[PDB]
Amino acid sequence: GLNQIDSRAVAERINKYLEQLTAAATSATEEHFNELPRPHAVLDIIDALIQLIIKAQQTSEEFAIYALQQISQLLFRQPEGTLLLESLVHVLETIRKIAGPQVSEQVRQLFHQQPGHLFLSLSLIAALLGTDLLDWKNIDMAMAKALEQRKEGSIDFLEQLMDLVLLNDTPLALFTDFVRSLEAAWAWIVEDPDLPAAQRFKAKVRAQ
Ligand code: NA
């Protein structure tokens, strides 16, 4: 409902807030979004972006939709900063709630449309646990391919992922959500038993 010049200004400010957040979260000593005190630069950027989306919602969905595309696109860049990943997942989940369930589902669908290998970052998975955006079939298929390809330390990534989602007393996934990875990993252990991660994993499997 705004003039193309007025709407563009909001888009550029959404991006400047994400540029600012990237900077602020990186520099900041705090490693987690919870341990952030009041006041804090990271929280002040988050505050302004949310207040921008709340004002912009009154005219149209478009701004919240755009902000979510940008945040998602940033997460897919696979940043490793836990403070940044947590801040980004926080802002995303807020804008999904602000924007209603139509837009909130569109975000789930966008995540579930991405090639599994994009999520093959433990720090990214960790950040996204507690959202509906993780697709265990896609993630499973991705690791399965890496293990088949005998990619350096994939058995280690698999063990690590399992301690992260299964071994967690309140689990977010089932051991069966990872059949294909388990098979791929077992096949590699069958071929070359003389591997270090192979011993730890052989035990984890026989344990369950
Ligand atoms: Na930091």
Q: Which two tokens stand for residue 147?
A: 């293990």
59-64 own/partner pairs: CB under 8 Å, 24+ apart: 59/1, 59/2, 60/1, 60/2, 61/99, 61/100, 61/103, 62/7, 63/10, 63/11, 63/14, 64/95, 64/98, 64/99, 64/103
Residue 79 alpha carbon to ligand 1 centre in Å: 12
Residue 205 alpha carbon to ligand 1 centre in Å: 35
Q: What is the dihedral of CA 136, 109, 124, 185, to 10 degrees?
A: 20
- Number of folded domains that form the chain: 1
Residue 89 alpha carbon to ligand 1 centre in Å: 15
Q: Which of 1, 127, 105, 118 is nearest to 56 (CA)?
A: 1
Using a CB cutoff of 5 Å, list residues around ligand 1, an ion. 28, 83
Instruction: State the structure-solving technique.
Output: X-ray
Give this entry's resolution in angstroms.
3.0
Contact 44, 79 (CB under 8 A): no
Residue 29 alpha carbon to ligand 1 centre in Å: 5
Residue 19 alpha carbon to ligand 1 centre in Å: 15
Residue 93 alpha carbon to ligand 1 centre in Å: 20
Please say whether the dihedral angle defined by the alpha carbons of residues 130, 57, 79 and 109, taken in this order, is positive or negative.
positive
Residue 194 alpha carbon to ligand 1 centre in Å: 39
98: amino acid identity, one letter: I
Residue range(s) defining the domain that contains residue 73: 1-208
